[PDB]
Amino acid sequence: PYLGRIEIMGASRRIERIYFEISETNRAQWEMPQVKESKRQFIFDVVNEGGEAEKMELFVSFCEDTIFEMQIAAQISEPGELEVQRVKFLNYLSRNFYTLRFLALFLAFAINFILLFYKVSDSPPNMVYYFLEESTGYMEPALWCLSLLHTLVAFLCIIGYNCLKVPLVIFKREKELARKLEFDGLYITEQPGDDDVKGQWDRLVLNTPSFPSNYWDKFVKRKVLDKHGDIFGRERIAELLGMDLASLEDVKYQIWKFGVIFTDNSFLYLGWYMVMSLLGHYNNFFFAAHLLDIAMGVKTLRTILSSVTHNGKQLVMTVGLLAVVVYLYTVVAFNFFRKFYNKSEDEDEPDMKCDDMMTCYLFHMYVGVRAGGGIGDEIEDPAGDEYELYRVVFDITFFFFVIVILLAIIQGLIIDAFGELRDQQEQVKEDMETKCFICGIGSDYFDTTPHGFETHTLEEHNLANYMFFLMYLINKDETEHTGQESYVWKMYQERCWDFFPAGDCFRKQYEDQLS
């Protein structure tokens, strides 16, 4: 239950097994369903768009993100007066962030249910008047209290997000910047261009005293100095990083953090939610924009809409193609078929829709594309004229190419998106169930022993066990490190992932003795 075992390619050039204790809180926080979903999304991402060389780097990054999330969850878990009450309230919002997010979705549907009882009258209950019409009389007070409650809940959602999810954003940003500083020399040798807005903005935090505040590595500045001093000037590097080399013998940081947060998509969405909730008090119908949150909420709806967004570039390109081809038909009509576009039944005021190129394009794009039979179901009958056969060819080509072919292209794009997403999921599942994540040896090898692959993935090469070992190493002070622990610790500090068993396992190595 607590005996966590891994296999690492050791210093002796042989696969060896390491044993460590897994904490119960860490085990429960791993079994948490949000963490399970994070793991599932990571696995899908890697298997779908990943590489063999990049896989271990991505896996270690995912483990580090998970470890930080576990620490945040432990901080917010259930345990002068102003500070003690503030901490409890802020932690309460973080533990209940998703309940508030679901509470705001119920308040959006509750409010929009009231709005269906609206009416418009010229006379008060020329400026028109809007009012709720209900005999119960409780709908209007319910609407008022529900709008106030909804704005309150949106604000609480923003605060809970800032206390829950913003730390991970800052941790990711700091660790990426530290890695670019140390193992790439980005601001020392590379100096990113103006096109990298993120790289240009990150220059603010280098000089700050508390540059690492969420990322656990408190020796990043020392390591960057030690690596790049002899090559780029110790005094220059110290001035760049805001570190006093003589002592070796935060408004700027806060502004940087605010920029990082305000460039975050989820925070921007929550701010938009709060803004529209504030405008819902100026006009009640602005609360209808919160119904759009069902997409960002319900996972079923998000999966359904992924079929639309998967080929979104092809969909907009096909719409532009439809616009071009309807322009071509408009050219042909405006030059040869102008007389058939009279939309006025009166014999005194002809309402020609194709005596102008802009008007004929608007008429085509609107009515000939929304019509079932094309533009021939909307313009004058061609029979009897000299251009009858030309008009028939015109209408039938419009019907075939625009009504049939192009709408078929759009619908086929959606259907192909459904099929492609299904087979992506199937391929990820097949890879995971037929191959090992850590070593890549197929299940056929392990299945020689009954339940061999399940035993291998649950005991020997459990990626969860590797994550728990990283937690163990990070938490354990280096003084108490054992030999193999220090070997793996140095390989992790150098960002070298050769200690992961690649294509070799304990059974494969010692099958001779296990026979």
Ligand X SMILES: Nc1ncnc2c1ncn2[C@@H]1O[C@H](COP(=O)(O)O)[C@@H](O)[C@H]1O
**Residues in the site for ligand X, rule: CB under 6 A?**
432-433, 436-438, 457, 461-463
| C-alpha 493 chain-centroid distance | 29
Residue 192 to residue 373: CA distance in whole angstroms:
57
Position 495 contacts a second copy (CB under 8 A): no
Cβ-based nearer residue to a second copy, 199 or 297: 297
Residue 207 to residue 198: CA distance in whole angstroms:
16
For the CB of residue 429, give the shortest distance to ligand X in the complex, in Å: 8
Cβ-based nearer residue to Zn ion, 483 or 503: 503
Residue 464 to residue 458: CA distance in whole angstroms:
9
Residue 311 to residue 297: CA distance in whole angstroms:
21
Encoded one letter per residue, x for contact with a second copy by CB under 8 A and - for no contact, window 277-306 reads: --------x--x--xx-x---x-xx-xxx-
433 is in an annotated binding site: yes
The partner in contact with residue 301, picked from a second copy, ligand X, Zn ion, none with C-beta cut-offs of 5 to 8 angstroms by kind, is a second copy
- Indicate if the alpha-carbon torsion angle 18, 21, 27, 29 is positive or negative: negative
39 is in an annotated binding site: yes
For the CB of residue 149, give the shortest distance to a second copy in the complex, in Å: 21
Residue 30 to residue 468: CA distance in whole angstroms:
9
Residue 405 to residue 409: CA distance in whole angstroms:
6
3-state secondary structure 136-158: CCCHHHHHHHHHHHHHHHHHHHH
Number of shown-chain residues binding Zn ion (CB under 5 A): 4
Cβ-based nearer residue to ligand X, 214 or 457: 457
Residues in region 453-482 near Zn ion by CB under 5 A: 461
Residues in region 415-454 near Zn ion by CB under 5 A: 436, 438-439
Encoded one letter per residue, x for contact with a second copy by CB under 8 A and - for no contact, window 423-462 reads: -----------------x------xxxxx-----------
Pairing of strands 129-132, 118-121: antiparallel
Residues in region 395-414 near a second copy by CB under 8 A: 395-396, 399-400, 404-405, 407-414
> How far is the CA of 331 from the CAs of 272, 358, 360, in angstroms?
43, 10, 9
Cβ-based nearer residue to Zn ion, 4 or 280: 4
Pairing of strands 3-9, 15-21: antiparallel
Cβ-based nearer residue to ligand X, 147 or 462: 462
Strand partners, 4: 20
Position 334 contacts a second copy (CB under 8 A): yes
40 is in an annotated binding site: yes
485 is in an annotated binding site: no
Binding site for ATP: what residues are annotated? Answer: 36-40, 432-437, 457-463
Binding site for Ca(2+): what residues are annotated? Answer: 479
